[model samples]
Target: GVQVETISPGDGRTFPKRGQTCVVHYTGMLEDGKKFDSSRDRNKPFKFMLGKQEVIRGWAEGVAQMSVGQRAKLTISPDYAYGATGHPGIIPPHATLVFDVELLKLE
Candidate 1:
Protein backbone atom coordinates (compact mmCIF):
# COMPACT_ATOMS: atom_id res chain seq x y z
CA GLY A 1 0.00 0.00 0.00
CA VAL A 2 1.17 3.50 -0.70
CA GLN A 3 0.32 6.69 1.05
CA VAL A 4 -1.21 9.14 -1.35
CA GLU A 5 1.03 12.10 -1.96
CA THR A 6 -0.08 15.08 -3.97
CA ILE A 7 1.68 14.66 -7.30
CA SER A 8 3.26 17.98 -8.08
CA PRO A 9 4.14 19.55 -11.41
CA GLY A 10 7.50 19.08 -13.14
CA ASP A 11 8.36 22.77 -12.71
CA GLY A 12 9.24 22.06 -9.04
CA ARG A 13 6.27 23.88 -7.62
CA THR A 14 4.38 21.73 -5.16
CA PHE A 15 1.03 22.42 -6.79
CA PRO A 16 -1.41 24.87 -5.24
CA LYS A 17 -1.48 24.81 -1.50
CA ARG A 18 -4.81 24.45 0.28
CA GLY A 19 -7.18 27.42 -0.08
CA GLN A 20 -5.87 28.45 -3.49
CA THR A 21 -8.38 29.03 -6.29
CA CYS A 22 -7.81 27.29 -9.60
CA VAL A 23 -9.35 26.77 -13.02
CA VAL A 24 -9.35 23.43 -14.81
CA HIS A 25 -10.70 21.24 -17.56
CA TYR A 26 -11.46 17.70 -16.59
CA THR A 27 -13.14 14.42 -17.45
CA GLY A 28 -14.21 11.86 -14.92
CA MET A 29 -14.89 8.22 -15.63
CA LEU A 30 -15.80 4.98 -14.02
CA GLU A 31 -13.33 2.13 -13.75
CA ASP A 32 -15.18 0.56 -16.64
CA GLY A 33 -14.35 3.76 -18.54
CA LYS A 34 -17.79 5.27 -18.71
CA LYS A 35 -17.58 9.03 -18.81
CA PHE A 36 -19.10 10.70 -15.82
CA ASP A 37 -18.17 14.32 -16.31
CA SER A 38 -16.20 16.39 -18.82
CA SER A 39 -15.43 20.08 -18.66
CA ARG A 40 -13.95 20.07 -22.18
CA ASP A 41 -17.35 19.84 -23.79
CA ARG A 42 -18.72 22.71 -21.77
CA ASN A 43 -16.97 25.40 -23.86
CA LYS A 44 -15.45 26.77 -20.67
CA PRO A 45 -13.20 25.55 -17.96
CA PHE A 46 -14.42 24.87 -14.44
CA LYS A 47 -13.26 26.80 -11.43
CA PHE A 48 -12.80 25.97 -7.77
CA MET A 49 -10.61 26.60 -4.77
CA LEU A 50 -8.32 23.92 -3.50
CA GLY A 51 -7.98 22.81 0.15
CA LYS A 52 -11.12 24.68 1.07
CA GLN A 53 -13.09 21.42 0.83
CA GLU A 54 -15.57 22.79 -1.63
CA VAL A 55 -15.52 19.47 -3.49
CA ILE A 56 -15.13 15.85 -2.56
CA ARG A 57 -11.88 15.13 -0.77
CA GLY A 58 -10.28 13.41 -3.74
CA TRP A 59 -11.21 16.23 -6.08
CA ALA A 60 -9.92 18.82 -3.67
CA GLU A 61 -6.69 16.94 -3.25
CA GLY A 62 -6.18 16.25 -6.95
CA VAL A 63 -6.88 19.82 -7.97
CA ALA A 64 -4.39 21.02 -5.42
CA GLN A 65 -1.66 18.89 -7.06
CA MET A 66 -1.79 20.73 -10.33
CA SER A 67 -0.30 23.82 -11.99
CA VAL A 68 -1.53 25.81 -14.94
CA GLY A 69 -1.22 23.71 -18.11
CA GLN A 70 -0.63 20.48 -16.27
CA ARG A 71 -2.70 17.36 -16.85
CA ALA A 72 -2.93 14.30 -14.68
CA LYS A 73 -4.98 11.15 -14.17
CA LEU A 74 -6.20 10.36 -10.72
CA THR A 75 -7.54 7.16 -9.17
CA ILE A 76 -8.90 7.89 -5.76
CA SER A 77 -10.31 5.40 -3.32
CA PRO A 78 -13.59 5.88 -1.53
CA ASP A 79 -12.05 7.39 1.56
CA TYR A 80 -10.43 10.09 -0.52
CA ALA A 81 -13.53 10.60 -2.58
CA TYR A 82 -17.28 10.53 -1.94
CA GLY A 83 -17.17 8.21 1.03
CA ALA A 84 -19.88 5.67 1.87
CA THR A 85 -22.80 8.04 1.63
CA GLY A 86 -22.28 8.58 -2.10
CA HIS A 87 -24.35 10.92 -4.25
CA PRO A 88 -27.00 8.39 -5.29
CA GLY A 89 -26.90 7.64 -9.04
CA ILE A 90 -24.03 10.02 -9.63
CA ILE A 91 -21.77 8.32 -7.14
CA PRO A 92 -22.13 4.96 -5.50
CA PRO A 93 -21.55 4.28 -1.87
CA HIS A 94 -17.84 3.87 -1.16
CA ALA A 95 -17.14 4.44 -4.78
CA THR A 96 -13.73 5.06 -6.26
CA LEU A 97 -13.18 7.87 -8.74
CA VAL A 98 -11.12 8.18 -11.89
CA PHE A 99 -10.38 11.56 -13.36
CA ASP A 100 -8.45 13.26 -16.12
CA VAL A 101 -7.71 16.79 -15.06
CA GLU A 102 -5.95 19.67 -16.73
CA LEU A 103 -4.96 22.63 -14.66
CA LEU A 104 -5.63 25.82 -16.56
CA LYS A 105 -5.03 28.45 -13.91
CA LEU A 106 -4.18 28.91 -10.27
CA GLU A 107 -5.42 32.16 -8.81
Candidate 2:
Protein backbone atom coordinates (compact mmCIF):
# COMPACT_ATOMS: atom_id res chain seq x y z
CA GLY A 1 0.00 0.00 0.00
CA VAL A 2 0.95 3.63 -0.37
CA GLN A 3 1.29 6.07 2.48
CA VAL A 4 0.17 9.54 1.51
CA GLU A 5 1.47 12.48 3.49
CA THR A 6 0.16 15.83 2.40
CA ILE A 7 2.70 18.62 2.28
CA SER A 8 0.20 21.11 0.90
CA PRO A 9 -3.56 20.92 0.69
CA GLY A 10 -3.53 22.85 -2.55
CA ASP A 11 -5.73 25.72 -3.75
CA GLY A 12 -8.47 23.76 -5.45
CA ARG A 13 -11.25 21.85 -3.78
CA THR A 14 -11.66 19.27 -6.51
CA PHE A 15 -9.72 16.07 -6.74
CA PRO A 16 -8.87 14.40 -9.97
CA LYS A 17 -11.18 11.62 -11.09
CA ARG A 18 -10.84 8.61 -13.34
CA GLY A 19 -10.29 9.41 -17.03
CA GLN A 20 -9.05 12.92 -16.31
CA THR A 21 -5.50 13.69 -17.24
CA CYS A 22 -3.32 14.55 -14.28
CA VAL A 23 -0.29 16.76 -14.73
CA VAL A 24 2.27 16.42 -11.99
CA HIS A 25 5.89 17.10 -11.16
CA TYR A 26 7.66 14.46 -9.12
CA THR A 27 10.98 13.38 -7.72
CA GLY A 28 11.42 9.66 -7.14
CA MET A 29 13.95 8.21 -4.74
CA LEU A 30 14.92 5.02 -3.04
CA GLU A 31 14.23 4.65 0.67
CA ASP A 32 17.97 5.16 1.17
CA GLY A 33 17.51 8.76 -0.11
CA LYS A 34 19.06 8.32 -3.51
CA LYS A 35 17.07 10.09 -6.19
CA PHE A 36 16.39 8.17 -9.39
CA ASP A 37 14.07 10.46 -11.31
CA SER A 38 12.58 13.93 -11.24
CA SER A 39 10.21 15.62 -13.62
CA ARG A 40 11.22 19.05 -12.34
CA ASP A 41 14.78 18.43 -13.39
CA ARG A 42 13.57 18.23 -16.96
CA ASN A 43 11.40 21.33 -16.66
CA LYS A 44 8.36 19.30 -17.61
CA PRO A 45 5.44 17.88 -15.76
CA PHE A 46 4.30 14.29 -16.36
CA LYS A 47 0.80 13.63 -17.62
CA PHE A 48 -1.19 10.44 -17.24
CA MET A 49 -4.83 9.47 -17.11
CA LEU A 50 -6.15 9.02 -13.64
CA GLY A 51 -7.06 5.43 -12.68
CA LYS A 52 -5.27 4.13 -15.71
CA GLN A 53 -2.50 1.54 -15.65
CA GLU A 54 -0.08 3.82 -17.44
CA VAL A 55 1.96 4.25 -14.29
CA ILE A 56 2.87 2.38 -11.16
CA ARG A 57 0.00 1.32 -8.91
CA GLY A 58 1.07 3.72 -6.18
CA TRP A 59 1.07 6.66 -8.56
CA ALA A 60 -2.42 5.90 -9.83
CA GLU A 61 -3.78 5.62 -6.33
CA GLY A 62 -1.82 8.45 -4.76
CA VAL A 63 -2.33 11.09 -7.45
CA ALA A 64 -6.05 10.51 -7.58
CA GLN A 65 -6.28 11.78 -4.03
CA MET A 66 -4.69 15.12 -4.91
CA SER A 67 -6.21 18.42 -5.99
CA VAL A 68 -4.60 20.98 -8.21
CA GLY A 69 -1.43 22.41 -6.69
CA GLN A 70 -1.33 19.85 -3.93
CA ARG A 71 2.02 18.56 -2.80
CA ALA A 72 2.55 15.22 -1.13
CA LYS A 73 4.98 12.52 -0.20
CA LEU A 74 3.97 9.08 -1.30
CA THR A 75 5.80 6.18 0.25
CA ILE A 76 5.21 3.14 -1.90
CA SER A 77 5.82 -0.44 -0.99
CA PRO A 78 7.18 -2.81 -3.59
CA ASP A 79 3.76 -4.36 -4.08
CA TYR A 80 2.57 -1.09 -5.50
CA ALA A 81 5.78 -0.14 -7.25
CA TYR A 82 8.07 -2.14 -9.47
CA GLY A 83 7.97 -5.11 -7.11
CA ALA A 84 10.47 -7.96 -7.23
CA THR A 85 11.53 -7.25 -10.77
CA GLY A 86 11.93 -3.53 -10.14
CA HIS A 87 13.32 -1.34 -12.90
CA PRO A 88 16.56 -2.76 -14.16
CA GLY A 89 19.56 -0.48 -13.65
CA ILE A 90 17.41 1.92 -11.65
CA ILE A 91 15.40 0.45 -8.82
CA PRO A 92 16.59 -2.58 -6.99
CA PRO A 93 14.54 -5.71 -6.39
CA HIS A 94 11.88 -5.39 -3.70
CA ALA A 95 12.80 -1.78 -3.08
CA THR A 96 10.56 0.74 -1.44
CA LEU A 97 10.18 4.10 -3.15
CA VAL A 98 9.52 7.65 -1.99
CA PHE A 99 8.11 10.31 -4.18
CA ASP A 100 7.76 14.04 -3.69
CA VAL A 101 4.82 14.80 -5.89
CA GLU A 102 2.95 17.93 -6.78
CA LEU A 103 -0.24 17.99 -8.72
CA LEU A 104 0.09 20.84 -11.19
CA LYS A 105 -3.05 20.54 -13.27
CA LEU A 106 -5.95 18.37 -14.34
CA GLU A 107 -7.48 18.30 -17.79
Candidate 3:
Protein backbone atom coordinates (compact mmCIF):
# COMPACT_ATOMS: atom_id res chain seq x y z
CA GLY A 1 0.00 0.00 0.00
CA VAL A 2 1.13 3.51 -0.79
CA GLN A 3 0.93 6.20 1.85
CA VAL A 4 0.64 9.90 1.19
CA GLU A 5 1.13 12.57 3.80
CA THR A 6 -0.65 15.89 3.64
CA ILE A 7 0.10 19.09 5.49
CA SER A 8 -1.98 22.22 5.90
CA PRO A 9 -1.71 25.60 7.59
CA GLY A 10 -4.53 26.69 9.84
CA ASP A 11 -6.09 29.40 7.69
CA GLY A 12 -2.81 31.26 7.88
CA ARG A 13 -4.32 33.29 10.66
CA THR A 14 -2.97 33.10 14.17
CA PHE A 15 -1.03 30.06 13.00
CA PRO A 16 1.99 29.39 10.91
CA LYS A 17 2.12 27.15 7.89
CA ARG A 18 4.78 25.13 9.65
CA GLY A 19 6.79 24.89 12.85
CA GLN A 20 4.18 26.72 14.92
CA THR A 21 1.61 25.12 17.20
CA CYS A 22 -1.90 26.35 17.96
CA VAL A 23 -4.05 25.83 20.99
CA VAL A 24 -7.66 24.93 20.27
CA HIS A 25 -10.73 23.43 21.82
CA TYR A 26 -12.59 20.85 19.80
CA THR A 27 -15.05 17.97 19.75
CA GLY A 28 -15.20 14.76 17.74
CA MET A 29 -18.25 12.74 16.86
CA LEU A 30 -19.31 10.01 14.50
CA GLU A 31 -21.44 10.63 11.45
CA ASP A 32 -24.21 8.97 13.40
CA GLY A 33 -24.09 11.80 15.96
CA LYS A 34 -22.28 9.89 18.64
CA LYS A 35 -19.85 11.96 20.66
CA PHE A 36 -16.42 10.38 20.65
CA ASP A 37 -14.19 13.04 22.18
CA SER A 38 -14.50 16.57 23.41
CA SER A 39 -12.48 19.11 25.34
CA ARG A 40 -15.38 21.43 26.08
CA ASP A 41 -15.97 20.19 29.60
CA ARG A 42 -12.35 20.54 30.51
CA ASN A 43 -12.40 24.09 29.18
CA LYS A 44 -8.93 23.48 27.91
CA PRO A 45 -7.64 23.54 24.40
CA PHE A 46 -5.53 21.03 22.54
CA LYS A 47 -2.19 22.07 21.14
CA PHE A 48 -1.12 20.98 17.69
CA MET A 49 1.35 22.02 15.06
CA LEU A 50 0.24 22.87 11.57
CA GLY A 51 1.82 20.89 8.78
CA LYS A 52 3.60 18.92 11.43
CA GLN A 53 3.30 15.43 12.86
CA GLU A 54 1.45 16.65 15.89
CA VAL A 55 -1.86 14.98 15.06
CA ILE A 56 -3.62 12.79 12.53
CA ARG A 57 -3.50 13.49 8.82
CA GLY A 58 -7.14 14.49 8.62
CA TRP A 59 -6.85 16.75 11.60
CA ALA A 60 -3.85 18.55 10.19
CA GLU A 61 -5.66 19.11 6.94
CA GLY A 62 -8.94 20.09 8.51
CA VAL A 63 -7.61 22.68 10.91
CA ALA A 64 -5.87 24.51 8.12
CA GLN A 65 -9.15 26.12 7.15
CA MET A 66 -9.69 27.66 10.51
CA SER A 67 -8.46 30.74 12.33
CA VAL A 68 -8.71 31.96 15.87
CA GLY A 69 -12.25 31.39 17.16
CA GLN A 70 -13.25 29.63 13.98
CA ARG A 71 -15.17 26.40 13.59
CA ALA A 72 -15.97 23.79 10.98
CA LYS A 73 -17.33 20.33 10.31
CA LEU A 74 -15.04 17.86 8.64
CA THR A 75 -15.62 14.33 7.42
CA ILE A 76 -12.53 12.29 6.64
CA SER A 77 -12.26 9.11 4.63
CA PRO A 78 -10.20 6.14 5.71
CA ASP A 79 -7.55 7.14 3.22
CA TYR A 80 -7.01 10.41 5.07
CA ALA A 81 -7.89 8.89 8.37
CA TYR A 82 -6.66 6.04 10.46
CA GLY A 83 -6.08 3.34 7.88
CA ALA A 84 -6.11 -0.40 8.55
CA THR A 85 -4.46 -0.08 11.92
CA GLY A 86 -6.70 2.52 13.48
CA HIS A 87 -5.79 4.49 16.59
CA PRO A 88 -6.00 2.30 19.62
CA GLY A 89 -8.68 3.20 22.19
CA ILE A 90 -9.88 6.05 20.02
CA ILE A 91 -10.88 4.83 16.60
CA PRO A 92 -11.92 1.54 15.10
CA PRO A 93 -9.82 -0.21 12.51
CA HIS A 94 -10.30 1.27 9.03
CA ALA A 95 -12.95 3.64 10.32
CA THR A 96 -13.70 6.98 8.77
CA LEU A 97 -13.96 9.98 11.05
CA VAL A 98 -16.27 12.95 11.39
CA PHE A 99 -15.29 15.92 13.46
CA ASP A 100 -17.11 18.99 14.69
CA VAL A 101 -14.18 21.22 15.41
CA GLU A 102 -14.15 24.60 17.08
CA LEU A 103 -11.06 26.69 17.12
CA LEU A 104 -11.68 28.49 20.33
CA LYS A 105 -8.22 29.92 20.49
CA LEU A 106 -5.01 29.88 18.54
CA GLU A 107 -1.66 30.76 19.99
Candidate 4:
Protein backbone atom coordinates (compact mmCIF):
# COMPACT_ATOMS: atom_id res chain seq x y z
CA GLY A 1 0.00 0.00 0.00
CA VAL A 2 2.31 2.70 -1.16
CA GLN A 3 1.18 6.27 -0.66
CA VAL A 4 2.30 9.87 -1.02
CA GLU A 5 1.32 12.56 1.46
CA THR A 6 2.07 16.26 1.54
CA ILE A 7 3.24 17.44 4.90
CA SER A 8 3.55 21.01 3.76
CA PRO A 9 2.35 22.66 0.64
CA GLY A 10 4.70 24.46 -1.73
CA ASP A 11 4.59 27.72 -3.63
CA GLY A 12 2.68 27.02 -6.84
CA ARG A 13 5.16 28.72 -9.17
CA THR A 14 8.14 26.40 -8.80
CA PHE A 15 7.01 22.91 -9.57
CA PRO A 16 9.58 20.50 -10.91
CA LYS A 17 9.09 19.51 -14.51
CA ARG A 18 10.77 17.01 -16.75
CA GLY A 19 14.39 17.82 -17.63
CA GLN A 20 14.59 20.30 -14.79
CA THR A 21 16.86 19.76 -11.84
CA CYS A 22 15.38 19.49 -8.35
CA VAL A 23 17.12 20.00 -5.04
CA VAL A 24 15.65 18.32 -1.98
CA HIS A 25 16.25 17.17 1.53
CA TYR A 26 15.02 13.72 2.43
CA THR A 27 15.09 10.97 4.98
CA GLY A 28 14.87 7.40 3.73
CA MET A 29 13.62 4.64 5.94
CA LEU A 30 12.03 1.27 6.12
CA GLU A 31 8.37 0.87 7.04
CA ASP A 32 9.37 -0.36 10.45
CA GLY A 33 11.09 2.92 11.27
CA LYS A 34 14.62 1.90 10.38
CA LYS A 35 16.42 4.77 8.73
CA PHE A 36 18.67 4.25 5.77
CA ASP A 37 19.81 7.73 4.76
CA SER A 38 19.23 11.40 5.37
CA SER A 39 20.22 14.47 3.38
CA ARG A 40 19.29 16.70 6.29
CA ASP A 41 21.84 15.00 8.52
CA ARG A 42 24.43 15.54 5.82
CA ASN A 43 23.63 19.26 5.83
CA LYS A 44 23.03 19.36 2.10
CA PRO A 45 20.18 18.76 -0.26
CA PHE A 46 20.27 16.05 -2.90
CA LYS A 47 19.98 16.98 -6.52
CA PHE A 48 18.55 15.10 -9.48
CA MET A 49 17.13 15.93 -12.88
CA LEU A 50 13.47 15.10 -13.24
CA GLY A 51 12.57 12.35 -15.74
CA LYS A 52 16.26 11.56 -16.23
CA GLN A 53 16.41 8.37 -14.17
CA GLU A 54 18.78 10.11 -11.81
CA VAL A 55 16.72 8.69 -9.01
CA ILE A 56 14.39 5.73 -8.46
CA ARG A 57 11.02 5.78 -10.19
CA GLY A 58 9.15 6.36 -6.95
CA TRP A 59 11.28 9.36 -6.17
CA ALA A 60 10.93 10.77 -9.65
CA GLU A 61 7.19 10.26 -9.68
CA GLY A 62 6.73 11.78 -6.27
CA VAL A 63 8.99 14.74 -6.95
CA ALA A 64 7.37 15.38 -10.27
CA GLN A 65 4.10 15.89 -8.45
CA MET A 66 5.60 18.41 -6.06
CA SER A 67 6.40 22.11 -6.03
CA VAL A 68 9.37 23.93 -4.57
CA GLY A 69 9.21 24.04 -0.76
CA GLN A 70 6.72 21.20 -0.63
CA ARG A 71 7.27 18.59 2.02
CA ALA A 72 5.95 15.13 1.26
CA LYS A 73 6.13 11.54 2.31
CA LEU A 74 6.44 8.88 -0.31
CA THR A 75 5.70 5.24 0.31
CA ILE A 76 7.24 3.22 -2.45
CA SER A 77 6.49 -0.29 -3.36
CA PRO A 78 9.42 -2.55 -4.17
CA ASP A 79 8.45 -2.58 -7.81
CA TYR A 80 8.67 1.19 -8.14
CA ALA A 81 11.64 1.38 -5.87
CA TYR A 82 14.81 -0.61 -5.26
CA GLY A 83 13.24 -3.80 -6.47
CA ALA A 84 14.42 -7.32 -5.73
CA THR A 85 18.13 -6.60 -6.24
CA GLY A 86 18.14 -4.00 -3.49
CA HIS A 87 21.19 -2.33 -1.98
CA PRO A 88 23.27 -4.70 0.07
CA GLY A 89 23.03 -4.32 3.86
CA ILE A 90 21.39 -0.93 3.72
CA ILE A 91 18.27 -2.37 2.18
CA PRO A 92 16.94 -5.85 2.01
CA PRO A 93 15.66 -7.42 -1.14
CA HIS A 94 11.91 -6.97 -1.89
CA ALA A 95 11.70 -4.15 0.58
CA THR A 96 9.41 -1.15 0.60
CA LEU A 97 10.66 2.36 1.21
CA VAL A 98 9.33 5.37 3.06
CA PHE A 99 10.79 8.77 2.39
CA ASP A 100 10.06 12.10 4.01
CA VAL A 101 10.96 14.61 1.34
CA GLU A 102 11.32 18.35 1.27
CA LEU A 103 11.66 20.07 -2.07
CA LEU A 104 14.10 22.96 -1.86
CA LYS A 105 14.89 24.12 -5.34
CA LEU A 106 13.70 23.63 -8.89
CA GLU A 107 16.16 24.57 -11.59
Q: Which number leads on TM-score?
A: 2
| RMSD per model, one decimal | 3.2, 1.1, 5.7, 1.5
* Model 2 global lDDT (CA atoms, 0 to 1): 0.92
**TM-scores for all predictions:** 0.81, 0.94, 0.73, 0.92
Tens digit of lDDT per residue, candidate 4, span 1-107? 34779999999577787899999999999878888899998998899998889788998898888888899999999888889998888888988999999999877
| Candidate 4 TM-score versus the reference | 0.92
Question: What C-alpha lDDT values do all the predictions have?
Answer: 0.71, 0.92, 0.65, 0.88
Candidate 2 per-residue lDDT, tens place, 1-107, comes to 89999998887587998899999999999999999999999999999998679999997798887888899999999999999999899999999999999999999
lDDT of 3 at 61: 72
Residue-level error in angstroms, candidate 1, position 47: 0.7
Ranking by TM-score: 2, 4, 1, 3
> On residues 7-106, what C-alpha lDDT tens digit does candidate 3 reach at each position?
2333445633565676666677655667788877577778887777767777777776566556667777767777888778877787777766666555
Best lDDT goes to which candidate? 2
Question: Between the candidate structures 3 and 4, which one is better when assessed by TM-score?
Answer: 4
Q: For residues 1-107, what per-residue lDDT tens digits would candidate 1 score against the true structure?
A: 11233344434464786677778887877656788788897878888877667766777776665666667777778888778897798888877778777777777
Query: In terms of TM-score, how similar is model 1 to the real structure?
Result: 0.81
Candidate 2 regions off by >4 Å? none
Model 4: which residue pairs collide? none
Model 1, residue pairs in steric clash: none
Better of 1 and 3 by lDDT: 1
